[PDB]
């Protein structure tokens, strides 16, 4: 069923399936990295590739080396390719050169090709709009990729992680402030402690994601400069005077995001500092979720032999083989994503170290973890917030058990009774299985209303 | 234009679209774990749940409680998993319940309904093989993922990591051979050193993978060993007598490979060991390749600004106002999949490190990277051997030049006038920019004839 | 030769070195954790511990809670270990409890035995100030080693790191603006590019460093909070009312360093999310210096076999069998200190994800990992600046050399001769191993002068 | 008060500390290389350099290169180090060059030093031993460093990481015999599943440690292969016939274990992959043994607000007035250990790819990272066995309440009500609070006395 046309470079013929807009270079490409599975480039870097085409398209006319019709013909197959019209017009891999030259060839021909039917012509014969000398005029591969990485980058982090990390952000705050006057044991080293509220315990969550937010946000300015400009090396050749500024004044435009062209190209070629940066603040959102998520599945734990002290939503069954049990599986879900996380950052930190003289050749590989970091938090805070943090509820009847059996609240009795009285009514306690209350009373040392009155768990959570 | 069938679980109702094969639970996963790509779980996973399947049923029958008519029907889906006919069955993602059970309920629902339509019943109706009571008979999630896991893990690596580098071992072997008579110049702290030949120079990036090789191979025998039989906690509770051992050589039958029990199930549930040791190896192999990758594009990089003793394929058309132009497109390629492997292993390890009690319940992320990691070692040295090794030459001249010239072979006068006499020669070379022979001349330390006699670069490439 | 004193607890008799001002429970701590070399905690966390114990002092006395005549010996006591005049009386290792409790006990007999020597009575006598009643007055080892923590790691990155690093990126300045007229060809992919000047490409290191400085800045905000306060859970429970601002006024005048009191204490305690914001800043600055320092040593690489565009310090003798070899060993150890920041930031977020309740229980570890991160960053920077940044120098021939036999400036005659002519220099000059002129010239396209006048070098580096 | 005596190199004049055994090359990285701690370089190391130079000097003479007097005195010198009493003359730091040169020089110059006063001699006098042409004879820093690291890593692992691990797998082993009759509840997902016994997690425990021990001595034969005659570029120019395959032989006679001379002297040179090899060994023990520490404090979590179901032992006096609490301090230094593991693993690898032509020069960072896991392993294993595991206690009567209150042991019901119809009473039970019997008979499912003789944890830790 396979129909192709029949094009040609010097490499000899070249079969492209016959309804394609790619061309023979892209056509090449698919062979010369057959590597994972096929178009894993993200779908993310062709939009921001089709955002900044078509603003050098319309720097270029500005400036006068590039005709408006031109343009007009560019710049409206890059709104199809925004549109999501086109995606299946990309069949390559991350795994290709680390300039990612061909998956800027891969949108030049695509460009060129749809433009020419778009005008009225036919698939397979010479386009108006030349992939090279139009589509990529004052432009390099080098500096074509990582406008787009960071593009895709900024706009994933702003439209996607940040709104989904505040909105767990809220809730955890609402659940906070509900729980603020519910007294539950504290737990370090994982044995029994002092008292504090369960709204104490959750606004810890809440700062920590407020921190990270702050963090990520921090890292933001650097990922808003652009390389595009910088042409092969940095120097700009062969742009117009004032392209760098009047594209990145475009894309900022098309993309309704805060770009500026970079203050320094050579730093912006030859390194991916700013995705570090900002890639160590994902990981650093992911190492906190990681703990709020442990914590809440340690909470719910049980519900008979584990902890117990909060009650989870139950989505799905957990398990064929035990009947009615219900896991914490939102938390697991956040977990794995954290767990991946981490790794990205190391696949970023080294790739990030190898830049040689005048360019960074790792920038798919860093752009493909950076992506997926910032994507799978944003899906897994909107997951957990929506079928787990919304509906913790407390269990007080289970947490004021926990708060009654203990012996870490005797210490409230020093001021009263004294020390080594406090100390035997604990060590009878202990040795007997029995509540603090219950030896007070019992060894004569303090009646059951005075015990009440000095020993209040709700005084304890505070200086 | 959706219309769905109503289901149900232990837990309530559930729609489920009207023509798919998979049931209540798989559809609660698909919509409660909306994270990433659909569809994410790896297809070898869902191809090593049909083969544990198939020997489940098998050995569910000869132990007498499963009928074989039942196991043949569920043979039969199996077969067609393996065929890759149904994967628009399988519809979950990576980031699931961390222990897979969505993935092992989204077979046996799958399972149970195909085979209904292959008896001739309508797709909805009460089937004759039952999700739970005939397909996952004697079965957990807690001990199926694990063994998908393995299966899936062992197999990628025998079948493709392997042989992909033993073929790029081959042809640098062939090329060390072929280059072992080129003397060049060494470089040690990038700086010009004592001379070597281009073929010992590419022994050094066989022995690499040789070692390479040998420590993943020796790890195969712990990631042979499967969780099937464990069941939820690792006792085996609820199967037949001898099902641990019986399902584990129907699994190496059918698979062609040779798994076998696990020698202790809690091991086997509440760790996931075997692939930290497994994916150590891979991340080995990926250090070596870097390296090599590293060292290749290096020793080409020119045509003028560089080094530019070896040739390397151009695999992309060129243009005419750039001849001689130097296109490192595998060594790329390659050096990003290592960068890959090297985070892998980071999440790998981190997760391994997690489990709780019974059961460690991060067991797609790691059968996720593990099999990536594997996968893109194989296909990039598939590429690198094919696009970049097979086609390596040397660029004689080039290298004739650059060892002439290099001061270290005044190592060579040690023997005569000492080290510091020769040192003193270098040193006042590189200082004014002059040869080492006119310097040696210069500070009356060697006559000419005494510099050509003694200096010979072909005799500097071994022992004494 | 070892005389001992005998302390008493209940384990029973335990002997002490005769001479050593820690106690009983310092002594039992060495054995219980014999994990690596005696004495590993690091100095930094000791004198950190000084300034918090001081100013907890300092707070408990002003709040009426402790003696003024107790204050000034125990401050007393801090002093002189701020001075340096006791680091042989901490002997414990870093893995001891995740708290840091054993750290916390060290000083606080050590305090408490040194300050009744200093009161006149002799070593091993019962001491006026008790070392949990007085000198842990209002605090727990859970909110003393955090505060420790942040203490010891801000003032490592304000005092050591920061600077070491501004001075580095000084030098690299001064070396770009030096080196603005040089040009160099580019290399891309290792391969030969289009040219650029030395100065651009060393500004490309400046600016590296410059957005590291920025990024390890906007981190300190949130390392200036302190836990102390806390004490056990988070709750302030046995702290007077105001103690916690109090007590961050007084570390904050001690040290002069802008401390703060945690806004949420059960972030402070149950998460060390600064240490992992700071630490991926000393990492992005790592990830930045190891491209620094490959580039410098690939340059300066050869002498005659390699690049050899620059030339740097040469400090020692490189080698003992190859006479007159000088490596570039600065480049060495600085690249091997970045290789080790990598990894102590995979230490410190596996840590960071690891807290559990109330307690995060891995201190000791993330404030290892930190403080060496923040050390071997300035030190290196330090060393490197000063024995190579400072004397890197042009190899002014060599670099024209490369210019004028490169292959890739001939797109400077394409406006002039057209394209095709162009690539006939080219092709004609790769094919004979000549210079682009030399076939301009001998082919009959250009003459010498208007080759000069169309192909200028120092008109190539910019737009 | 400081007073030197001037001495020189190939480069210049030196000024020396007049006591100290070193010479000019160890004084400049000295002082050229203040970079962390003092004399950070580590102990061990020098005590590999002392093993292999003294079998250089036994090599040497063997094939008529050197006289037996100069073996002689530089071997006695090497018998100093080896007794501990020259540690003050080795000054340098990891941080210097990357090859380890200078600590090379720094022993040449201890022994040629040194030798002199045992031979009679003034400190700062010519020598009878010359550093570079005794001492240094027939090596190179690019095989020695190698040869050191390799020494010093083997040696750790053998008599000190192994031995500390095999004692607590040991002690573990005798907990789980002694604990194979306590049936105790199982946890998934950290959530109440079906029972097992207390043995049986523990020897959970054991398989891991056993698998890692394994894992770690497959990686043993390459880290035994020595680079010693490659010297500068690996080709062993300017060694004599025969030396590598005679200096290995002398290493691992005066070591006593089984060094032998690396097949590809490239290799040897141009990567540390043996180093990533066993680190990757040592990071799946400390995977491993992250998760004993972490569940053996989860399952002592107490003495009221958690599990209970065991006791571990008290290292220091506690309080009076805080009966019953548990410090859980081994599981927290163990855990720190374990963490520093998983990031020294991260700096070897990345170290491990960076490896240029015929050198690799992070060899001092490798060697320090990797000798600090093999030890911080050793030492936290004594001290976890010896402070926690031999003590290891199970609380019986909580043991017993946890696995009674269980709902999944409704899944013993399963085989005479089914699965839907017992997770409905479990369900049921979760629901209201109440016991799984209370609901069963509320339900109609099942009887009081069908319950009794239905339900029996002990008969749930095997198979059918």
């Not at 609240?409 to 509540?435: C, F, P, R, S, W």
Request: net charge negative; glycine share 8%; with cysteine.
């Amino acid at each position: 069923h396979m129909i192709y046309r029949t094009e040609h470079d010097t490499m000899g013929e070249v079969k492209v399936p016959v309804d394609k807009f790619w061309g023979a270079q892209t056509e090449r490409s698919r062979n010369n990295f057959k590597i994972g599975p096929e178009a894993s480039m993200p779908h993310e870097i062709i939009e921001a590739f089709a955002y900044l085409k078509k603003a050098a398209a319309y720097a270029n006319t500005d400036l006068r080396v590039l005709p408006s019709d031109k343009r007009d013909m560019i710049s409206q197959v890059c709104d199809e390719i925004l549109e999501g019209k086109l995606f299946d017009q990309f069949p390559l891999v991350i795994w290709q050169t680390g300039s990612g030259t061909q998956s800027n060839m891969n949108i030049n021909e695509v460009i060129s090709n749809k433009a020419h039917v778009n005008n009225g012509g036919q698939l397979g014969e010479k386009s108006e709009v030349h992939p090279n000398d139009d589509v990529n005029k004052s432009q390099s591969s080098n500096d074509t990729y990582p406008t787009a990485m960071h593009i895709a980058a900024y706009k994933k982090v702003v439209e996607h992680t940040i709104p989904a990390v505040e909105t767990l952000k809220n809730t955890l705050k609402a659940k906070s402030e509900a729980f603020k006057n519910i007294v539950k044991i504290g737990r370090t080293h994982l044995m029994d402690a002092t008292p504090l509220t369960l709204g104490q315990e959750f606004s810890g969550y809440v700062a920590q994601l407020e921190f990270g937010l702050k963090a990520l946000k921090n890292t933001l300015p650097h990922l808003a400069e652009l390389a595009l400009g910088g042409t092969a090396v940095g120097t700009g050749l062969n742009t117009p005077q004032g392209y760098d500024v009047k594209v990145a004044e475009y894309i900022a435009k098309f993309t309704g995001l805060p770009f500026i062209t970079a203050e320094n190209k050579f730093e912006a070629l030859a390194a991916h500092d700013a995705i570090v940066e900002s890639h160590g603040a994902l990981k650093q959102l992911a190492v906190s979720l990681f703990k709020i998520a442990q914590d809440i599945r340690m909470l719910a734990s049980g519900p008979r032999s584990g902890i117990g002290e909060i009650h989870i939503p139950e989505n799905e069954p957990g398990s064929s083989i035990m009947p009615g049990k219900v896991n914490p599986t939102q938390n697991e879900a956040m977990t794995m994503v954290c767990a991946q996380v981490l790794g990205n950052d190391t696949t970023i930190s080294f790739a990030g170290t190898q830049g040689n003289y005048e360019l960074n050749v790792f920038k798919p590989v860093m752009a493909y973890n950076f992506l997926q970091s910032a994507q799978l938090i944003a899906d897994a805070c909107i997951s957990f917030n929506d079928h787990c943090a919304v509906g913790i509820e407390p269990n007080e009847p289970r947490i004021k058990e926990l708060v009654d059996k203990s012996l870490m609240l005797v210490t409230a009795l020093n001021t009263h009774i004294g020390y080594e009285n406090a100390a035997k009514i604990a060590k009878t306690a202990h040795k007997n299985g029995t509540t603090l209350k219950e030896e007070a009373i019992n060894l004569g040392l303090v009646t059951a209303e005075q015990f009440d009155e000095w020993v209040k768990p709700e005084d304890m959570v505070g200086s």
